[PDB]
């Protein structure tokens, strides 16, 4: 009877482990029974509790394949099935109240951000993300990394690159599993190269060179080169060739964001070092891009803050700064201040540890 | 529930004591410098 309760539970976990294509024959047919299994004498008990005996991951694996819409087949106004999942996951979400829930709770948020990333709208993300903070000391190294990956994706549409760079770089330094070195690793790399492109600071893909397929690399190089050399012409023809690629990965958003960046990168390489830079040169470069908006674009260029310049067109010179800092006041001290904060948090962990 | 009160009590004694650890620790810092100086 003690044994009976326990025996049901061990059986429920066991059925969940088996069904990743062993003694199985249709993940979707079986879903009904998996929902059935989950909720009595398991999901029910845990009301103020969280564990790694309850795991969204097992159910995630199951649910993910159905969302290729090949079992739905787009015969229908909306999926029922995803709505059901979402209803049920949100039902857990209530139960969590940030007292001991950070564990399983965090997976549900990964799932929720994924559905927005497939085809929803990513403005709803903001609250979940905030709710979802509370000291994290029970989430696994792979889980941290996936969450960051999804979070980074959110940030990028919202036009927040720096924040996304920090998270993706922090992600790849979790996960000693050899199972997240496989295709997942490739996806992660993709996103780190995209963020590098957006900032437009972009280094060469050297590091990536012995950790991706040479097939992946060459197109990936092609994009980076397009930005770096600073041609619109080069960039457009690279988009044209590797159309299937940018579509496939779903990082088609680049084509909007990057175009304005590419043209700016192209002025930047042309030097702005001395007290005046003659107007004719800068006009010449721009003339190739567009010669009806040479004043409008240079003005916009300055406004952005990427580069900064002064123009007289009653002298017809463009006046510029070095683009090199000074050390004589608070701004290097602010870097000193960030570093000491980082050290203290780290110190607190070593002592605790 | 008579049980819950009791358990809350046990925990409370414990709390006063967790602050108490800290207060002896602070004190020891002062005495450590003075001793090292003395030598």
């Amino acid at each position: 009877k003690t044994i009976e309760v326990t025996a049901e539970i061990n059986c429920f976990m066991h059925l969940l482990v088996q069904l990743f294509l062993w003694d199985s024959k249709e993940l979707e047919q079986l879903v009904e029974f998996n929902r059935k299994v989950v909720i009595p004498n398991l999901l029910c008990y845990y009301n103020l509790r969280s564990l790694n005996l309850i795991n969204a991951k097992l159910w995630f694996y199951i649910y993910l394949s159905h969302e290729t819409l090949a079992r739905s087949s787009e015969e229908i106004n909306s999926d029922n099935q995803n709505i059901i999942l979402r209803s049920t996951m949100m039902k857990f979400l209530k139960i969590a109240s940030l007292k001991h829930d950070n564990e399983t709770k965090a997976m549900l948020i990964n799932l929720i951000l994924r559905d927005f990333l497939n085809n929803g709208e990513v403005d709803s993300a903001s609250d979940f993300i905030s709710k979802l903070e509370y000291p994290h000391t029970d989430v696994s190294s792979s889980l941290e990394a996936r969450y960051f990956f999804y979070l980074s994706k959110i940030n990028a549409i919202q036009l927040d690159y720096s924040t996304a760079n920090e998270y993706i770089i922090a992600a790849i330094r979790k996960a000693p599993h050899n199972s997240k070195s496989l295709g997942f690793l490739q996806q992660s790399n993709k996103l780190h190269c995209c963020i590098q492109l957006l900032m437009g600071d972009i280094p060469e893909l050297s590091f990536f060179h012995q950790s991706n397929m040479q097939k992946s690399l060459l197109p990936y190089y092609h994009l980076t080169k397009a930005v770096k050399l600073g041609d619109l012409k080069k960039f457009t023809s690279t988009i044209t060739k590797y159309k299937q690629l940018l579509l496939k990965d779903d990082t088609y958003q680049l084509c909007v964001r990057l175009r304005s960046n590419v043209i700016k990168t192209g002025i930047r390489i042309i030097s702005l070092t001395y007290k005046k830079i003659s107007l004719r040169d800068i006009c010449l470069k721009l003339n190739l891009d567009s010669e009806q908006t040479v004043e409008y674009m240079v003005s916009r260029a300055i406004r952005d803050g990427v580069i900064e310049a002064k123009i007289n067109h009653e002298d017809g010179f463009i006046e510029t700064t070095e683009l090199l800092n000074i050390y004589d006041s608070e701004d290097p001290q602010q870097v000193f201040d960030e570093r000491i904060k980082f050290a203290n948090q780290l110190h607190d962990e070593y002592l605790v540890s | 529930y008579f049980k819950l009160k009791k358990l809350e009590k046990e925990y409370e004694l414990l709390t006063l004591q967790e602050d108490y650890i800290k207060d002896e620790q602070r004190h020891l810092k002062r005495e450590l410098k003075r001793a090292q100086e003395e030598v």
Binding site: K99 | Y1, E8, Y11, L14, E18, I21, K22, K29
Partner: peptide
């Protein structure tokens, strides 16, 4: 009742961090 259980739970969490400090206090 549920709220009373939660208050107790948070005390249990704080203690472990103290235990690691009970060790540090002894070294001093």
């Amino acid at each position: 009742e549920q709220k009373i259980q939660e208050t107790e739970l948070k005390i249990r969490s704080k203690t472990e961090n103290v235990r690691r400090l009970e060790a540090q206090r002894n070294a001093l």
